[PDB]
């Protein structure tokens, strides 16, 4: 028997809006430690990693470890039925997932039973390594940058140095250059210059409501890490394969 109560229903609503546009089906791994999700996209080019620590939930119980095959689109539709102030309860047994929406400002109780599915997908393991550059900046600033450069080109050249960070794009209309100065903080070991598809970055930036800040971890010839810390509850990480150069 699994039962997790989250007072901040919005968190789960936002988490699902951040995922649904990148992945349609993902396996939700439940354990005594908390909720874990690790899935790669349809184009096999980006990877999502969600971690919601049990300590982040008001109530958390997990008798047996579950691996629920969820259709993120269906779960999103269900979560859209939850009010922005609702207390969300997740309850599952070792066939379906039950979502209960307790409304604070009313005597209304919503109870949804979502059909699960069997997911035979590619499981990939990410070793936590050290990056040559780690940029921490306002999530909104980042989302604006990615959206802006999208009007100029398809790829973004992220150049990270001691001074600041630079994002550039080129297209048929001309070229663009956004230079940020060191709140923006840089934990650089070696300077890095990497090229990434803006298409994918703009899917990642859908996690913007989750955090006031975003962190970009870069090391040469390795995927980018765009992390959104949830609220001491956990995080949501997006990995993006760099462009062959």
């Amino acid at each position: 028997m699994f039962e997790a109560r989250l007072v901040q229903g919005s968190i789960l609503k936002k988490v699902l809006e951040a995922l649904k546009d990148l992945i349609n089906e993902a396996c939700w791994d439940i354990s005594s430690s908390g909720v874990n999700l690790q899935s790669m996209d349809s184009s096999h080019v980006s990877l999502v990693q969600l971690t919601l620590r049990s300590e982040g939930f008001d109530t958390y119980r997990c008798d047996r470890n579950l691996a629920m095959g969820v259709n993120l689109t269906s779960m999103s539709k269900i979560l859209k039925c939850a009010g922005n102030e609702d207390i969300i309860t997740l309850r599952a047994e070792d066939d379906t997932l039950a979502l209960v929406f307790e409304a604070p400002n009313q005597e209304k109780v919503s109870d949804y039973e979502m059909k699960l599915m069997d997911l035979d997908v590619e499981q990939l393991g990410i070793p936590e390594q050290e990056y040559s550059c780690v940029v921490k900046m306002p999530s909104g600033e980042f989302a604006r940058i990615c959206r802006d450069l999208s009007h100029i080109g398809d790829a973004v050249v992220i150049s990270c140095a001691k001074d600041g960070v630079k994002f550039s794009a080129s297209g048929e209309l001309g070229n663009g250059n956004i230079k940020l100065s060191q709140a923006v903080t840089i934990e650089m070991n070696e300077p890095v210059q990497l090229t990434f598809a803006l298409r994918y970055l703009n899917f990642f930036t859908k996690a913007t409501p989750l955090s006031s800040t975003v962190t970009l971890s870069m090391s040469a010839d390795v995927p980018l890490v765009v992390e959104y810390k949830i609220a001491d509850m956990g995080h949501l990480k997006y990995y993006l394969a760099p462009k062959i150069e």
Partner: peptide, 11 residues
């Protein structure tokens, strides 16, 4: 101009 390597190639 540039293409990408699969995320599997890194993981």
């Amino acid at each position: 101009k540039s293409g990408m390597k699969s995320i599997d190639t890194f993981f």
